[PDB]
Amino acid sequence: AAAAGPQVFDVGPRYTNLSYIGEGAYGMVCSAYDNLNKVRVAIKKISPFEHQTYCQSTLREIKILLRFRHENIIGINDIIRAPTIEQMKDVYIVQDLMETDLYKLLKTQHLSNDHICYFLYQILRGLKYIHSANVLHRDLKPSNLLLNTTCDLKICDFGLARVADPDHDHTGFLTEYVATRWYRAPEIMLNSKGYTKSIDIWSVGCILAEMLSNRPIFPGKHYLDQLNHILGILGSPSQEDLNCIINLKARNYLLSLPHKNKVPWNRLFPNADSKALDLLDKMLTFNPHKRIEVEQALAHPYLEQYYDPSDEPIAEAPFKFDMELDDLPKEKLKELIFEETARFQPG
Ligand SMILES: [Mg+2]
Numbered sequence: 001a002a003a004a005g006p007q008v009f010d011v012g013p014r015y016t017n018l019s020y021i022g023e024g025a026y027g028m029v030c031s032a033y034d035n036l037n038k039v040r041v042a043i044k045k046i047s048p049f050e051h052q053t054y055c056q057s058t059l060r061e062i063k064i065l066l067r068f069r070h071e072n073i074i075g076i077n078d079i080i081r082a083p084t085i086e087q088m089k090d091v092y093i094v095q096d097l098m099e100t101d102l103y104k105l106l107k108t109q110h111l112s113n114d115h116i117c118y119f120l121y122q123i124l125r126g127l128k129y130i131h132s133a134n135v136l137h138r139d140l141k142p143s144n145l146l147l148n149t150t151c152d153l154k155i156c157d158f159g160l161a162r163v164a165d166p167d168h169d170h171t172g173f174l175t176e177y178v179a180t181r182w183y184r185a186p187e188i189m190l191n192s193k194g195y196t197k198s199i200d201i202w203s204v205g206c207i208l209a210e211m212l213s214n215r216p217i218f219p220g221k222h223y224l225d226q227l228n229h230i231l232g233i234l235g236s237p238s239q240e241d242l243n244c245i246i247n248l249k250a251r252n253y254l255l256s257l258p259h260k261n262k263v264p265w266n267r268l269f270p271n272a273d274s275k276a277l278d279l280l281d282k283m284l285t286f287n288p289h290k291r292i293e294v295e296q297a298l299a300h301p302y303l304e305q306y307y308d309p310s311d312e313p314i315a316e317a318p319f320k321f322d323m324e325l326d327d328l329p330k331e332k333l334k335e336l337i338f339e340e341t342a343r344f345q346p347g
Contacts, residue, residue: 004030011043011080011092018043025159026054027090031097041077044093048337055333056325057159058091062340064135064158067319072126074098074146074156079341088338098154102207103143106214113273115151116211120279121298121306122153123204128294130155131197132314134164138194139179140203142210163319165195173249174224181226182206182216186234187288189227190250198288201297205283212269212276217284234286235262241287275302 002009004018005028011018015032022029027045034041048054065076078094102119105111111119123145130137137144137158144157160179171193177184179194185202188194209217217233220226231237236259245251265277279300282292292300298307325333 004028007045009043009045011094014078015041015043015080015094026058034094040097042095042097043080044095045090046093047090049089049330049334052328052330052333055330055337056328059325059333059337059340060161061158062093062337063321064161064319066340068129068133068315070126070129070313071152072122072154073129074154079344081338081341083345083347085335085338088334091337091341095156096154097148098146099149100147101143102145102147102153102211103141105147106142106210110214111211113276116208116276117273117302117305118151119145119147119153119211120204120208120276121303123155123207124294124298124303125312126153126155127200127204128298128312129315130161131164131200131294134318134320135161136164136195136197137161137200137203139183140200140207141180141183142207145207162195163321164197169193169195170247173247173253176223181220181223182218184226185288186227186230186286189224190254191245191247192288196288197293198291201283201291201294202288204297205280208276208280208283209269212272212280217268230286231257231260233263233268234284235260237286241290244287244289273302275300278302 002011002018004020009018009028009030011032014035016035017033018030020028020030021042024044026048029042029044031040032043046058048058062076065074069075074095076093076095080092080094082088137155138160139157144155146154146156169192171191173190175193177188177194183203183206185199188199206217218226218229220229236257237254242251242254265280266272269277279297279302283297285291298312
């Protein structure tokens with residue numbers, strides 16, 4: 001009994017006065033007035049129950065976001081659903097209302113170096129917590145970074161997040177992958193399933209570049225073009241880095257390419273702070289084993305104004321899934337979603 005651009009947005013009497021914000025992957029996002037806490041909030045309507053992939057993403061995000069507690073990671077304030085599994089068609093996730101996201105901001109606004117530095121700090125601060133829980137976000141990009149009017153930044157969208165599993169990271173050349181193309185590390189196309197923390201650091205490096213110029217640094221038009229873009233800037237990998245790739249097919253593909261020299265960062269970003277470019281270089285390192293880790297990045301001179309490891313908290317314990325969600329049907333995932341959201345029922 002409350003409508004927005006039809007569909008139904010029925011968020012009990014607690015939340016009223018809706019306004020469209022945008023379209024999520026599984027439904028509408030609206031702002032609403034929270035009559036209890038007397039502030040406006042964001043509410044995401046999720047109708048995932050007709051697809052198993054949607055159910056997986058929904059369950060991951062709920063389980064992770066309820067477990068995590070950090071200033072730079074969006075929290076779940078409330079979840080609204082029907083009182084029984086039979087009656088539950090949609091789920092509504094309530095969060096703090098953020099003003100915008102970095103994707104929307106970068107369309108029209110140039111960032112000062114101070115804004116770049118602070119936003120990077122907050123990304124990495126949140127990421128340290130996520131990594132400390134042994135979790136990989138796996139889809140870091142501007143539209144998954146929420147911003148408010150006072151420049152607070154919160155990472156959102158944990159629908160592709162997994163527990164880190166470096167021992168099972170290896171795969172064949174040109175193995176298909178799910179997360180957003182432009183932000184994919186080179187090894188994803190070569191030999192990696194994206195089960196190590198280094199894949200997130202690559203994504204942050206792409207985000208830093210994009211903050212510096214207001215355009216994606218590696219805008220590949222398709223799967224293999226993405227690697228072409230990356231190599232066009234970094235240049236040909238060294239022999240040492242090629243020897244680290246044991247995958248014959250991936251190694252021979254790289255050996256087949258003409259030599260390319262590195263494009264210097266200060267040619268690409270002539271107005272950028274030199275320390276920012278030095279950190280960028282270390283995040284956008286081809287060899288994932290040599291790539292900077294989150295705690296080192298925080299300690300980099302670029303971020304010296306903000307660095308304080310005692311104020312960069314970690315998770316109280318590693319995160320673990322009870323069961324593997326990929327092997328679970330539509331219906332069992334619905335069941336788990338119901339149980340995970342039970343704490344918010346008057347009940
Ligand atoms: Mg998103």
